Design an enzyme around this catalytic site. Structure first.
Site, PDB file in Angstrom:
ATOM      1  N   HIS A  38     -53.357 -43.720  46.984  1.00 17.10           N
ATOM      2  CA  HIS A  38     -52.332 -42.838  47.528  1.00 17.10           C
ATOM      3  C   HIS A  38     -52.743 -41.377  47.349  1.00 17.10           C
ATOM      4  CE1 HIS A  38     -49.411 -45.919  48.593  1.00 17.10           C
ATOM      5  NE2 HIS A  38     -49.388 -46.408  47.365  1.00 17.10           N
TER       6      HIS A  38
ATOM      7  N   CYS B  94     -53.337 -40.711  51.953  1.00 16.71           N
ATOM      8  CA  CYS B  94     -52.485 -39.823  52.729  1.00 16.71           C
ATOM      9  C   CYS B  94     -52.674 -38.385  52.265  1.00 16.71           C
ATOM     10  CB  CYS B  94     -51.018 -40.233  52.610  1.00 16.71           C
ATOM     11  SG  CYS B  94     -50.668 -41.900  53.209  1.00 16.71           S
TER      12      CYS B  94
END
Lengths: 4, 140, 93, 93, 139, 4
Positions: free
Chosen positions: B88, B130
């Protein structure tokens, strides 16, 4: 679909 | 004289950090599919000639230390260095299992003045993560 | 004599700043699928920027999202290459 | 069908994020001097990433600062290329 | 594998050359930038770009200049180029009267906001500081 | 030398  | 010199005893180290599971305090879900990524990347970079190492579910401290020690190793006989981050993230930031750490600080270990044996050698970082919450709707 | 301490880095991001990055639980992330696919065929004969440009193209054209959440339906992705390289990079010879 | 709205951009920054960018009042900025020099000789026969890679090399090696303010003495610079291009770019044919 | 360059024009090239700044901004004169802008004009003209140089632009002028360019018809152009010469900080560039985000200047040329540059290269060259760190170098 |  997935999210990072 | 326009190409990086690749005549070294080895191509170099390839570090893969594969973060699938996160502490629930972080709000982050399981990154299903990432094991398939790590397997594919591993086979791929091994085929290129890299000495591949795979790390799993790393804390921020582990990632910082892991990369710090790699930068302190002797790369004199390597042509380059590669690191792959699967996790992430948000802008300028990547998740450990226990929180976030700046991308700048992970890569800073390999700066010319902090990793002399990789001086004038390419340092590659591949980052699957991301970088915010915006979506691209596309066109046409 | 001297070399900038920030020289000779290359960052291959799966997406552009501010944006989301896609991952198929069954197949893996879009960026990694594309990266591996192009590296398997051209890792040994193409320069690194040529490889990543082709990765950019494949992610941009071969992928479009499906979700039961219409907020996440039919979305697209473009990767982002940041180069401080001072030479061309081939993984051979 | 669709193409990402952020696709096919290229940003050629004179320097890396967080860093300063230098300019000689008599001769112009380091990045532009190098950019024009490489473009003058190779603008028509090299791919744009090859051009900017050579620009990176020129800024990194041919330039080092002189200032009587020692804080700004003997400093270096590396440019920074951000590519969302999906094809190779030549300025000819 | 290559961008199609078989068009009647290479494309438009905008050079924004900011030398002088309102005292309000605290920013000094960017001596040498005129030599930059002239040298760039010749190079990009030689490549085939239709180059126009704008001087000492306000933030509003820069925003309008790029907005207007993105609204022109690029159907017969192969690509688009813009060159920014100014002071700056991270993610931002100086007009004569203040700062404006680089993202907002370039967003006009997104695929969904500039249909005639779709699938065509959009180039941005930026001479500007991006912070205050100095690179001491090594060896 | 000057700073931008």
């Amino acid at each position: 679909v997935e999210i990072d | 004289t326009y190409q990086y010199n690749m005549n070294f005893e080895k191509l170099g180290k390839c570090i893969i950090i594969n973060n699938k599971n996160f502490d629930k305090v972080t709000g982050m879900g399981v990154r299903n599919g990432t094991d398939k990524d790590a397997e594919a990347l591993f086979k791929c970079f091994r085929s290129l000639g890299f000495d591949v190492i795979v790390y799993n579910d790393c804390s921020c401290a582990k990632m910082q230390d892991l990369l710090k020690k790699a930068s302190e190793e002797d790369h004199t006989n390597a042509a380059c260095f590669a690191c792959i981050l699967l996790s992430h993230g948000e802008e300028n930031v990547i998740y450990g299992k226990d929180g976030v750490t700046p991308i700048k600080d992970l890569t800073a270990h390999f700066r010319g003045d902090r990793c002399k044996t990789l001086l004038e050698k390419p340092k590659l970082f591949f980052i699957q993560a991301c970088r915010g919450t915006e979506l691209d709707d596309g066109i046409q | 004599y001297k070399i900038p301490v920030e020289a000779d880095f290359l960052f291959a991001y799966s997406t552009v700043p501010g944006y989301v990055s896609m991952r198929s639980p069954g197949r893996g992330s879009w960026f990694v699928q594309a990266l591996c696919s192009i590296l398997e065929e051209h890792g040994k004969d193409l320069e690194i920027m040529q490889i990543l440009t082709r990765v950019n193209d494949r992610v941009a054209r071969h992928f479009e999202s499906c979700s039961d959440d219409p907020h996440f339906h039919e979305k697209k992705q473009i990767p982002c290459v940041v180069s401080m390289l001072t030479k061309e990079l081939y993984f051979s010879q």
